[PDB]
Amino acid sequence: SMSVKKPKRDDSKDLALCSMILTEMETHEDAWPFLLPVNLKLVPGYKKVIKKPMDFSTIREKLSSGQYPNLETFALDVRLVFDNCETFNEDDSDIGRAGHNMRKYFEKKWTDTFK
């Protein structure tokens, strides 16, 4: 509350550390369904079904241009990629499995880096 603050967690490395995590996600072998925006002209149903498309290249542009106010807003866009994936793809598909693997990979890096 006013003039009463919890001790200040050091957030000065967050930008760099999120960038690293993102690089690791970009270079994982199962990243291929997530590297670029889904092409809304060419994938029937995507535009109408997925309210908020997200992909690693778009996350990378937002990051580089100061559009994440903090590390939680970055984690929300990453998780959005995998939530979108689960919404549109069967678990038993290559893309569905990809998304499950990438989320697992992300969540471990997130906890080891910050928690």
Residue 23 sits in a domain whose CATH number is: 1.20.920.10
Quote the number of domains for the chain.
1
Q: Which domain holds residue 27?
A: 1-115
Neighbours of 30 (CB within 10 A): 16
Q: In the chain, after which residues does the backbone break, taking C–N over 2.5 angstroms as a break?
A: none
User: For the chain, how are helix, strand and coil distributed in percent, rounded to 5?
Assistant: 60, 0, 40
20 contact partners, CB below 8 Å, separation of at least 6: 113
Q: Which of 80, 70, 85 is nearest to 12 (CA)?
A: 70
How was this one solved?
X-ray
Report resolution in angstroms: 2.0
CB 33 within 8 A of CB 95: yes
What is 43-85 written as a DSSP string? Answer: STTHHHH-SS---HHHHHHHHHTT--SSHHHHHHHHHHHHHHH
Distance between CA atoms of 106 and 40, rounded to whole angstroms? 26
56 contact partners, CB below 8 Å, separation of at least 6: 22, 25, 26, 31, 34, 35, 36, 81
